[PDB]
Amino acid sequence: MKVILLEPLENLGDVGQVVDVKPGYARNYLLPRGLAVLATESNLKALEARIRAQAKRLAERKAEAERLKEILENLTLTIPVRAGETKIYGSVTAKDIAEALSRQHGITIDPKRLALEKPIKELGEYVLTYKPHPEVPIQLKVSVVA
Amino acid sequence: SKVCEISGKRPIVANSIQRRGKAKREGGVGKKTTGISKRRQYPNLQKVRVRVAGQEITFRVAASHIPKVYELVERAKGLRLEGLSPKEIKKELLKLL
RNA sequence: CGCGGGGUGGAGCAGCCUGGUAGCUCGUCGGGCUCAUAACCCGAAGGUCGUCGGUUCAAAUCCGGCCCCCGCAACCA
RNA sequence: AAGGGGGCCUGACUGCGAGGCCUGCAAGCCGAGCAGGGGCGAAAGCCGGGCCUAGUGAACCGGUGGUCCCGUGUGGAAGG
RNA sequence: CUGGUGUUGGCUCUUGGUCGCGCCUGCGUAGGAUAGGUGGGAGCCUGUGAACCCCCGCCUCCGGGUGGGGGGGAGGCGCCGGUGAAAUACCACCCUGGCGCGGCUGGGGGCCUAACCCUCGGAUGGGGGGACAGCGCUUGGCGGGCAGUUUGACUGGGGC
RNA sequence: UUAGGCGGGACCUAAGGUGAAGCCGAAAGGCGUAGCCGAAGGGCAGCCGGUUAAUAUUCCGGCCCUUCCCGCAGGUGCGA
RNA sequence: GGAGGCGUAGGGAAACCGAGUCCGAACAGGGCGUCUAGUCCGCGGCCGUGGACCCGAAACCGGGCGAGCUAGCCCUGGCCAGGGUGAAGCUGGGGUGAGACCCAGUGGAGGCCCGAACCGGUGGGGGAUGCAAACCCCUCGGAUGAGCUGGGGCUAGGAG
RNA sequence: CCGUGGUUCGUGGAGCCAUGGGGGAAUCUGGGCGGACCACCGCCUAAGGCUAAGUACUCCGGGUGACCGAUAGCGCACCA
RNA sequence: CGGUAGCGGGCGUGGAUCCCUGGAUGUCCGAAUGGGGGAACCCGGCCGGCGGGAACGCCGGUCACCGCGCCUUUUUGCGCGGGGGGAACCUGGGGAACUGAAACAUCUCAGUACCCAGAGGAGAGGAAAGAGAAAUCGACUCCCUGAGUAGCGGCGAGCGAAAGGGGACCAGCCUAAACCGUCCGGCUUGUCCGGGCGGGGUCGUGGGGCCCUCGGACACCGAAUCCCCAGCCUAGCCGA
Ligand SMILES: [Mg+2]
Ligand SMILES: [Mg+2]
Ligand SMILES: [Mg+2]
Ligand SMILES: [Mg+2]
Ligand SMILES: [Mg+2]
Ligand SMILES: [Mg+2]
Ligand SMILES: [Mg+2]
Ligand SMILES: [Mg+2]
Ligand SMILES: [Mg+2]
Ligand SMILES: [Mg+2]
Ligand SMILES: [Mg+2]
Ligand SMILES: [Mg+2]
Ligand SMILES: [Mg+2]
Ligand SMILES: [Mg+2]
Ligand SMILES: [Mg+2]
Ligand SMILES: [Mg+2]
Ligand SMILES: [Mg+2]
Ligand SMILES: [Mg+2]
Ligand SMILES: [Mg+2]
Ligand SMILES: [Mg+2]
Ligand SMILES: [Mg+2]
Ligand SMILES: [Mg+2]
Ligand SMILES: [Mg+2]
Ligand SMILES: [Mg+2]
Ligand SMILES: [Mg+2]
Ligand SMILES: [Mg+2]
Ligand SMILES: [Mg+2]
Ligand SMILES: [Mg+2]
Ligand SMILES: [Mg+2]
Ligand SMILES: [Mg+2]
Ligand SMILES: [Mg+2]
Ligand SMILES: [Mg+2]
Ligand SMILES: [Mg+2]
Ligand SMILES: [Mg+2]
Ligand SMILES: [Mg+2]
Ligand SMILES: [Mg+2]
Ligand SMILES: [Mg+2]
Ligand SMILES: [Mg+2]
Ligand SMILES: [Mg+2]
Ligand SMILES: [Mg+2]
Ligand SMILES: [Mg+2]
Ligand SMILES: [Mg+2]
Ligand SMILES: [Mg+2]
Ligand SMILES: [Mg+2]
Ligand SMILES: [Mg+2]
Ligand SMILES: [Mg+2]
Ligand SMILES: [Mg+2]
Ligand SMILES: [Mg+2]
Ligand SMILES: [Mg+2]
Ligand SMILES: [Mg+2]
Ligand SMILES: [Mg+2]
Ligand SMILES: [Mg+2]
Ligand SMILES: [Mg+2]
Ligand SMILES: [Mg+2]
Ligand SMILES: [Mg+2]
Ligand SMILES: [Mg+2]
Ligand SMILES: [Mg+2]
Ligand SMILES: [Mg+2]
Ligand SMILES: [Mg+2]
Ligand SMILES: [Mg+2]
Ligand SMILES: [Mg+2]
Ligand SMILES: [Mg+2]
Ligand SMILES: [Mg+2]
Ligand SMILES: [Mg+2]
Ligand SMILES: [Mg+2]
Ligand SMILES: [Mg+2]
Ligand SMILES: [Mg+2]
Ligand SMILES: [Mg+2]
Ligand SMILES: [Mg+2]
Ligand SMILES: [Mg+2]
Ligand SMILES: [Mg+2]
Ligand SMILES: [Mg+2]
Ligand SMILES: [Mg+2]
Ligand SMILES: [Mg+2]
Ligand SMILES: [Mg+2]
Ligand SMILES: [Mg+2]
Ligand SMILES: [Mg+2]
Ligand SMILES: [Mg+2]
Ligand SMILES: [Mg+2]
Ligand SMILES: [Mg+2]
Ligand SMILES: [Mg+2]
Ligand SMILES: [Mg+2]
Ligand SMILES: [Mg+2]
Ligand SMILES: [Mg+2]
Ligand SMILES: [Mg+2]
Ligand SMILES: [Mg+2]
Ligand SMILES: [Mg+2]
Ligand SMILES: [Mg+2]
Ligand SMILES: [Mg+2]
Ligand SMILES: [Mg+2]
Ligand SMILES: [Mg+2]
Ligand SMILES: [Mg+2]
Ligand SMILES: [Mg+2]
Ligand SMILES: [Mg+2]
Ligand SMILES: [Mg+2]
Ligand SMILES: [Mg+2]
Ligand SMILES: [Mg+2]
Ligand SMILES: [Mg+2]
Ligand SMILES: [Mg+2]
Ligand SMILES: [Mg+2]
Ligand SMILES: [Mg+2]
Ligand SMILES: [Mg+2]
Ligand SMILES: [Mg+2]
Ligand SMILES: [Mg+2]
Ligand SMILES: [Mg+2]
Ligand SMILES: [Mg+2]
Ligand SMILES: [Mg+2]
Ligand SMILES: [Mg+2]
Ligand SMILES: [Mg+2]
Ligand SMILES: [Mg+2]
Ligand SMILES: [Mg+2]
Ligand SMILES: [Mg+2]
Ligand SMILES: [Mg+2]
Ligand SMILES: [Mg+2]
Ligand SMILES: [Mg+2]
Ligand SMILES: [Mg+2]
Ligand SMILES: [Mg+2]
Ligand SMILES: [Mg+2]
Ligand SMILES: [Mg+2]
Ligand SMILES: [Mg+2]
Ligand SMILES: [Mg+2]
Ligand SMILES: [Mg+2]
Ligand SMILES: [Mg+2]
Ligand SMILES: [Mg+2]
Ligand SMILES: [Mg+2]
Ligand SMILES: [Mg+2]
Ligand SMILES: [Mg+2]
Ligand SMILES: [Mg+2]
Ligand SMILES: [Mg+2]
Ligand SMILES: [Mg+2]
Ligand SMILES: [Mg+2]
Ligand SMILES: [Mg+2]
Ligand SMILES: [Mg+2]
Ligand SMILES: [Mg+2]
Ligand SMILES: [Mg+2]
Ligand SMILES: [Mg+2]
Ligand SMILES: [Mg+2]
Ligand SMILES: [Mg+2]
Ligand SMILES: [Mg+2]
Ligand SMILES: [Mg+2]
Ligand SMILES: [Mg+2]
Ligand SMILES: [Mg+2]
Ligand SMILES: [Mg+2]
Ligand SMILES: [Mg+2]
Ligand SMILES: [Mg+2]
Ligand SMILES: [Mg+2]
Ligand SMILES: [Mg+2]
Ligand SMILES: [Mg+2]
Ligand SMILES: [Mg+2]
Ligand SMILES: [Mg+2]
Ligand SMILES: [Mg+2]
Ligand SMILES: [Mg+2]
Ligand SMILES: [Mg+2]
Ligand SMILES: [Mg+2]
Ligand SMILES: [Mg+2]
Ligand SMILES: [Mg+2]
Ligand SMILES: [Mg+2]
Ligand SMILES: [Mg+2]
Ligand SMILES: [Mg+2]
Ligand SMILES: [Mg+2]
Ligand SMILES: [Mg+2]
Ligand SMILES: [Mg+2]
Ligand SMILES: [Mg+2]
Ligand SMILES: [Mg+2]
Ligand SMILES: [Mg+2]
Ligand SMILES: [Mg+2]
Ligand SMILES: [Mg+2]
Ligand SMILES: [Mg+2]
Ligand SMILES: [Mg+2]
Ligand SMILES: [Mg+2]
Ligand SMILES: [Mg+2]
Ligand SMILES: [Mg+2]
Ligand SMILES: [Mg+2]
Ligand SMILES: [Mg+2]
Ligand SMILES: [Mg+2]
Ligand SMILES: [Mg+2]
Ligand SMILES: [Mg+2]
Ligand SMILES: [Mg+2]
Ligand SMILES: [Mg+2]
Ligand SMILES: [Mg+2]
Ligand SMILES: [Mg+2]
Ligand SMILES: [Mg+2]
Ligand SMILES: [Mg+2]
Ligand SMILES: [Mg+2]
Ligand SMILES: [Mg+2]
Ligand SMILES: [Mg+2]
Ligand SMILES: [Mg+2]
Ligand SMILES: [Mg+2]
Ligand SMILES: [Mg+2]
Ligand SMILES: [Mg+2]
Ligand SMILES: [Mg+2]
Ligand SMILES: [Mg+2]
Numbered sequence A: 001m002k003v004i005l006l007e008p009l010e011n012l013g014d015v016g017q018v019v020d021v022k023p024g025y026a027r028n029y030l031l032p033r034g035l036a037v038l039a040t041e042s043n044l045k046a047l048e049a050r051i052r053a054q055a056k057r058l059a060e061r062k063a064e065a066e067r068l069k070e071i072l073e074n075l076t077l078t079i080p081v082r083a084g085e086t087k088i089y090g091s092v093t094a095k096d097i098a099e100a101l102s103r104q105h106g107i108t109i110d111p112k113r114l115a116l117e118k119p120i121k122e123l124g125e126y127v128l129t130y131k132p133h134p135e136v137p138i139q140l141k142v143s144v145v146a
Numbered sequence B: 001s002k003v004c005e006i007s008g009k010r011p012i013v014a015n016s017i018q019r020r021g022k023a024k025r026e027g028g029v030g031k032k033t034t035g036i037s038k039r040r041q042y043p044n045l046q047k048v049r050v051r052v053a054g055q056e057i058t059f060r061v062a063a064s065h066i067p068k069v070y071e072l073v074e075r076a077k078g079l080r081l082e083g084l085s086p087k088e089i090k091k092e093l094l095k096l097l
Numbered sequence C: 001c002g003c004g005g006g007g008u009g010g011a012g013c014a015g016c017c018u019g020g021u022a023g024c025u026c027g028u029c030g031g032g033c034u035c036a037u038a039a040c041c042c043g044a045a046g047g048u049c050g051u052c053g054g055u056u057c058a059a060a061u062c063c064g065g066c067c068c069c070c071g072c073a074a075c076c077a
Numbered sequence D: 001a002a003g004g005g006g007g008c009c010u011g012a013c014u015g016c017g018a019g020g021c022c023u024g025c026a027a028g029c030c031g032a033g034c035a036g037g038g039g040c041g042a043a044a045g046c047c048g049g050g051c052c053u054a055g056u057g058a059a060c061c062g063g064u065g066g067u068c069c070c071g072u073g074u075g076g077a078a079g080g
Numbered sequence E: 001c002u003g004g005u006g007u008u009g010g011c012u013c014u015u016g017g018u019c020g021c022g023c024c025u026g027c028g029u030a031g032g033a034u035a036g037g038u039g040g041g042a043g044c045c046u047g048u049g050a051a052c053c054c055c056c057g058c059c060u061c062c063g064g065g066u067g068g069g070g071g072g073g074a075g076g077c078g079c080c081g082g083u084g085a086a087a088u089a090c091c092a093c094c095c096u097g098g099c100g101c102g103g104c105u106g107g108g109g110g111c112c113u114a115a116c117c118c119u120c121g122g123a124u125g126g127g128g129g130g131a132c133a134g135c136g137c138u139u140g141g142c143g144g145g146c147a148g149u150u151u152g153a154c155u156g157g158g159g160c
Numbered sequence F: 001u002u003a004g005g006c007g008g009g010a011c012c013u014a015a016g017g018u019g020a021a022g023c024c025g026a027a028a029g030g031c032g033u034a035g036c037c038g039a040a041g042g043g044c045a046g047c048c049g050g051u052u053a054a055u056a057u058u059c060c061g062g063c064c065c066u067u068c069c070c071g072c073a074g075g076u077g078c079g080a
Numbered sequence G: 001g002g003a004g005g006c007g008u009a010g011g012g013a014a015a016c017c018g019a020g021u022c023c024g025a026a027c028a029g030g031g032c033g034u035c036u037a038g039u040c041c042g043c044g045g046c047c048g049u050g051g052a053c054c055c056g057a058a059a060c061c062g063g064g065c066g067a068g069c070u071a072g073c074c075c076u077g078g079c080c081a082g083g084g085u086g087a088a089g090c091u092g093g094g095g096u097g098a099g100a101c102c103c104a105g106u107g108g109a110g111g112c113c114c115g116a117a118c119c120g121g122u123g124g125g126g127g128a129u130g131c132a133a134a135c136c137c138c139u140c141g142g143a144u145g146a147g148c149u150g151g152g153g154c155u156a157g158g159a160g
Numbered sequence H: 001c002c003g004u005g006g007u008u009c010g011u012g013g014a015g016c017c018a019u020g021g022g023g024g025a026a027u028c029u030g031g032g033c034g035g036a037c038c039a040c041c042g043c044c045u046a047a048g049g050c051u052a053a054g055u056a057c058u059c060c061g062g063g064u065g066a067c068c069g070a071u072a073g074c075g076c077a078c079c080a
Numbered sequence I: 001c002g003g004u005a006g007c008g009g010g011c012g013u014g015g016a017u018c019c020c021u022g023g024a025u026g027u028c029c030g031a032a033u034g035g036g037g038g039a040a041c042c043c044g045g046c047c048g049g050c051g052g053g054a055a056c057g058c059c060g061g062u063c064a065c066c067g068c069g070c071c072u073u074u075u076u077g078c079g080c081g082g083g084g085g086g087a088a089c090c091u092g093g094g095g096a097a098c099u100g101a102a103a104c105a106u107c108u109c110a111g112u113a114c115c116c117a118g119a120g121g122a123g124a125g126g127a128a129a130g131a132g133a134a135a136u137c138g139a140c141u142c143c144c145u146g147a148g149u150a151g152c153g154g155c156g157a158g159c160g161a162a163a164g165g166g167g168a169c170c171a172g173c174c175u176a177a178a179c180c181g182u183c184c185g186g187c188u189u190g191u192c193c194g195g196g197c198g199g200g201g202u203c204g205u206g207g208g209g210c211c212c213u214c215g216g217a218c219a220c221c222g223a224a225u226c227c228c229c230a231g232c233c234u235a236g237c238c239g240a
């Protein structure tokens, strides 16, 4: 009969699928091992909750990032530092980038979701990538100065 | 085989009629009974062990109603059952029926 | 009643699936060898390939009917 | 001539059947005549198998060919 | 005793069946050589990589049918007809059969465990068997172990 | 027709019986673990004599015993 | 109380027709009908179904009751005078290289013997409306065994 | 669908109601039925349950007999 | 002051005996229920009482099992209930043979006798997935009829309906599901699932749910439930 997988089962289906098995395969193996559960009309609805909610927060979170992408690809973050010519070297790391962003624009970002190899050595015009959401890219204008 | 615990199915008396000769249907003279006698027909009773409230319950049912046993487990999942003897549980499951 | 497959020389016979050969053994005849007997070996006579109708350049080989022997299973008021 | 030969033929008919033989029943047997459509014969006539008396088996159950009578609300069909 | 099926599951190798599609198959004599049957045949295949040749694929009734691959660089083919009963090219649909892929389905071998069965003084487990066996429904078979009955009348008594 | 001491019970178990558990069976019921029951087997403390018309290891005489309860002394890790 | 029943139309398997109808091509010929009398109650004779004029089987089936007789087994107890024979073993002696083996003593075996209890029932006689629904007398078989026997238990009707 | 029961139905053209086995739906545009099956025309609403009266009987109480009268009438008139 | 006289004693108009109704007592056995058991006998636990009462005995109370509510902290407690009998009648589970067929096996006897479970003054059945041919009937049961018909049948022996008509009686209801509410549980956290409870709903002109519109919600019907009464039964009384 039809049952749903509570765990990925190769050559059978990925977790969450309705799948047709011999009844004996379900009754004496899959089911009493937590590997699947009956695709009863009740469970088929309980599944739907997860599917519904999960994709809802996930579509939520993607748009919840979109509110950032518009303001950040618009603006520029200016970070003044004690400087000489084109060198002075400071703790200007994603940490300070975020701190400088909280106090200047109020907005708060995760200094680890920020793409940056090493702390900025030189004064200059820098374009960082912020990836707050694995789908939504963000090109950040940051300018280090006097 | 006694009674099916789910369907109440139980053995009945049925005749063994013994015939002979060509059917009239096939242009034969007609069937002749050479004997009638009583036998019994038993329900296809089978054993279905199952685990409800972690305790292991064992039903004895016709093959016909085996899936109904598994329906009952599904339905007793919404139920206080813990610390009940296996008999206590089974009696409760059948109450759902 | 309904199925299945045979008839091929005097006896038994594969050729029939896969249309171009009536072939094999035994039988009889003649000749070789033989104490002889067999066996062996050379040759030879011997058939419409059941019938009749039909597809085909041609069919025992394929079709329709029919005859007959065996076989299979069922029925018998 | 009921016997022997030949010619032509299918009455080895269909629908009936007054009257009798026989007889416990049920059977069995003989039958003129009427109509249909035929055979042989110039015709009268004969022909409803065989010179006659044995050569047989009730009913039930089923088969086969007809017919188109019944057929479960109606038309078919199954079945009769 | 026995087939089917329910209880009855997982992996795998192998092998029939029927259907559909792609492809090949066809050898008497004649003969240019291996011509299935017909039907459209007079006009094609072609620098779209021909003939005249090298790996190598099956099939052969040992004469080749056929066909992936390698160099090619422009010619092979039938109409014409000679041989025949039937024409050789290219097309279509069929037949005999074989093979490849694709449904629907059957038969068989092996491994597996978890239903089922055994067992372990230790039991939501371990070991053994194992989808067999046992059990349900159904098929045919053997079946004085048991059961019900039949087993005629006439007849110088009955039987013979 | 008189019993702590005889027999039996308030002790034990045998065959077997019964039988919460469990298994099975159309119903009745069948099987059966524990437990319980089951003796002429195991275990347990009375001998001689006297007396009544009629009982006596039962009453009585003499000589001996058993268990149980309380208290006590001594003894000990007591305890199923 | 008229539901209902019989009767006032028959023929035909029926459709159907109707003093007719059926078979039939028939406007032959036959068959069965037409040419009114029924119905209700009582009584009587007989018939069908009921046990059907009365008494009588041997049997067949259902459900129970019986192993206080008898059979077998299970548990627990008990019984078997006396006498006879004298197995193995042991001991000692003989023997041989060591043995086998021999002799004597001791020993006390056995579905062994004679024979009471006890258990049987061989022959004869008696008994035969018996003392007795199986007895009595004489005689006989076993009597440490596959023995006898008490108490407690289990197995039954196509069953034990 | 297979094996059976019920009904007047004995396998019959065998429906209908029931169900031991196997396969196994639909929620009214759905299902079952009107004697195989099909079409038409109709009837009904399965797979949950309750319900008085009218009916049956006579241990018991009463009433009545073209019922018996002690071998009859119940086996028993009575200490059955 | 029974049959019942006898011996020996009592009672009654201060209303006895006797009859009716309701109480009380009610040893032991029996469903038999603390346990055993060879029924009417044997042995206990807990709590009280009695005797001088520790031992011993008596007395009063209590203690079986199964089901349901699981209201139960499963443990433990509590509550309602069951058990067994009954002349026949009733339903259900199982179910013969003699016999008939002038033999016999299908068939008959007969779903009878009988065994078992259960019901109750009755029981069964009962509100159409009916009948079956009429554009009809309208729950069930019982009687007459239809009818020994239609049919069934080694088409033998035999078996044997239904509709319709006439009567007795008369009566109809409750749910499951959609959907709303609540309550405990789930952990795939939820416009979700499951279990309980209440509301809602009850059908063949098809009904019901949910949303929209008028109506009425005070009209009407009405128990098979409860209350009261007449009447009736269980002693009697008058009576020419
Ligand atoms: Mg897989
Ligand atoms: Mg799927
Ligand atoms: Mg949400
Ligand atoms: Mg059972
Ligand atoms: Mg039955
Ligand atoms: Mg039955
Ligand atoms: Mg028949
Ligand atoms: Mg199972
Ligand atoms: Mg546990
Ligand atoms: Mg278990
Ligand atoms: Mg299943
Ligand atoms: Mg199934
Ligand atoms: Mg509960
Ligand atoms: Mg041969
Ligand atoms: Mg002449
Ligand atoms: Mg002459
Ligand atoms: Mg002559
Ligand atoms: Mg002549
Ligand atoms: Mg002549
Ligand atoms: Mg002539
Ligand atoms: Mg002439
Ligand atoms: Mg003739
Ligand atoms: Mg005349
Ligand atoms: Mg006349
Ligand atoms: Mg006559
Ligand atoms: Mg004659
Ligand atoms: Mg003429
Ligand atoms: Mg002439
Ligand atoms: Mg003429
Ligand atoms: Mg003549
Ligand atoms: Mg002649
Ligand atoms: Mg003659
Ligand atoms: Mg004859
Ligand atoms: Mg006959
Ligand atoms: Mg016929
Ligand atoms: Mg006939
Ligand atoms: Mg007609
Ligand atoms: Mg018709
Ligand atoms: Mg019709
Ligand atoms: Mg018709
Ligand atoms: Mg006909
Ligand atoms: Mg089998
Ligand atoms: Mg099988
Ligand atoms: Mg399987
Ligand atoms: Mg299988
Ligand atoms: Mg395999
Ligand atoms: Mg493979
Ligand atoms: Mg395959
Ligand atoms: Mg396709
Ligand atoms: Mg070709
Ligand atoms: Mg070359
Ligand atoms: Mg080479
Ligand atoms: Mg090759
Ligand atoms: Mg070559
Ligand atoms: Mg090649
Ligand atoms: Mg190439
Ligand atoms: Mg290359
Ligand atoms: Mg030319
Ligand atoms: Mg030419
Ligand atoms: Mg060619
Ligand atoms: Mg072309
Ligand atoms: Mg082909
Ligand atoms: Mg497949
Ligand atoms: Mg296989
Ligand atoms: Mg094999
Ligand atoms: Mg293995
Ligand atoms: Mg295993
Ligand atoms: Mg294994
Ligand atoms: Mg397991
Ligand atoms: Mg252990
Ligand atoms: Mg063990
Ligand atoms: Mg195990
Ligand atoms: Mg474990
Ligand atoms: Mg294991
Ligand atoms: Mg199996
Ligand atoms: Mg044999
Ligand atoms: Mg036999
Ligand atoms: Mg006979
Ligand atoms: Mg005999
Ligand atoms: Mg004589
Ligand atoms: Mg004779
Ligand atoms: Mg003593
Ligand atoms: Mg005594
Ligand atoms: Mg014991
Ligand atoms: Mg017992
Ligand atoms: Mg015991
Ligand atoms: Mg019990
Ligand atoms: Mg039990
Ligand atoms: Mg039984
Ligand atoms: Mg029991
Ligand atoms: Mg026992
Ligand atoms: Mg034991
Ligand atoms: Mg013990
Ligand atoms: Mg004890
Ligand atoms: Mg004890
Ligand atoms: Mg006892
Ligand atoms: Mg004891
Ligand atoms: Mg005792
Ligand atoms: Mg004792
Ligand atoms: Mg003793
Ligand atoms: Mg003692
Ligand atoms: Mg003593
Ligand atoms: Mg004395
Ligand atoms: Mg003394
Ligand atoms: Mg009448
Ligand atoms: Mg008509
Ligand atoms: Mg007419
Ligand atoms: Mg007339
Ligand atoms: Mg006419
Ligand atoms: Mg005429
Ligand atoms: Mg006329
Ligand atoms: Mg006449
Ligand atoms: Mg006439
Ligand atoms: Mg006349
Ligand atoms: Mg007249
Ligand atoms: Mg006249
Ligand atoms: Mg008249
Ligand atoms: Mg009369
Ligand atoms: Mg008669
Ligand atoms: Mg009689
Ligand atoms: Mg009479
Ligand atoms: Mg009579
Ligand atoms: Mg008999
Ligand atoms: Mg007998
Ligand atoms: Mg008994
Ligand atoms: Mg005895
Ligand atoms: Mg003794
Ligand atoms: Mg002794
Ligand atoms: Mg002696
Ligand atoms: Mg001497
Ligand atoms: Mg001696
Ligand atoms: Mg000696
Ligand atoms: Mg010594
Ligand atoms: Mg020595
Ligand atoms: Mg010595
Ligand atoms: Mg010496
Ligand atoms: Mg020596
Ligand atoms: Mg020597
Ligand atoms: Mg010694
Ligand atoms: Mg000696
Ligand atoms: Mg001796
Ligand atoms: Mg002797
Ligand atoms: Mg004696
Ligand atoms: Mg003598
Ligand atoms: Mg004598
Ligand atoms: Mg004598
Ligand atoms: Mg005598
Ligand atoms: Mg002597
Ligand atoms: Mg003697
Ligand atoms: Mg003696
Ligand atoms: Mg002697
Ligand atoms: Mg003994
Ligand atoms: Mg005994
Ligand atoms: Mg008997
Ligand atoms: Mg037997
Ligand atoms: Mg027996
Ligand atoms: Mg016997
Ligand atoms: Mg059926
Ligand atoms: Mg039935
Ligand atoms: Mg039937
Ligand atoms: Mg009936
Ligand atoms: Mg039937
Ligand atoms: Mg019939
Ligand atoms: Mg039928
Ligand atoms: Mg139908
Ligand atoms: Mg059914
Ligand atoms: Mg079924
Ligand atoms: Mg549907
Ligand atoms: Mg739907
Ligand atoms: Mg409808
Ligand atoms: Mg109907
Ligand atoms: Mg119809
Ligand atoms: Mg149909
Ligand atoms: Mg209807
Ligand atoms: Mg209903
Ligand atoms: Mg009722
Ligand atoms: Mg009375
Ligand atoms: Mg009276
Ligand atoms: Mg009198
Ligand atoms: Mg008298
Ligand atoms: Mg008198
Ligand atoms: Mg007298
Ligand atoms: Mg008398
Ligand atoms: Mg009486
Ligand atoms: Mg009296
Ligand atoms: Mg009396
Ligand atoms: Mg009496
Ligand atoms: Mg009395
Ligand atoms: Mg008296
Ligand atoms: Mg007195
Ligand atoms: Mg008195
Ligand atoms: Mg007196």
Ligand SMILES: [Mg+2]
Binding pocket: none
């Ligand atoms: Mg006086």
Ligand SMILES: [Mg+2]
Binding pocket: none
């Ligand atoms: Mg007064």
Ligand SMILES: [Mg+2]
Binding pocket: none
């Ligand atoms: Mg009393």
Ligand SMILES: [Mg+2]
Binding pocket: none
């Ligand atoms: Mg008791």
Ligand SMILES: [Mg+2]
Binding pocket: I033
């Ligand atoms: Mg109690």
Ligand SMILES: [Mg+2]
Binding pocket: I036, I037, I042
């Ligand atoms: Mg006792």
Ligand SMILES: [Mg+2]
Binding pocket: none
């Ligand atoms: Mg005590």
Ligand SMILES: [Mg+2]
Binding pocket: none
């Ligand atoms: Mg007490």
Ligand SMILES: [Mg+2]
Binding pocket: none
């Ligand atoms: Mg609580």
Ligand SMILES: [Mg+2]
Binding pocket: B083, B084, I074
């Ligand atoms: Mg609990």
Ligand SMILES: [Mg+2]
Binding pocket: I074
């Ligand atoms: Mg509890």
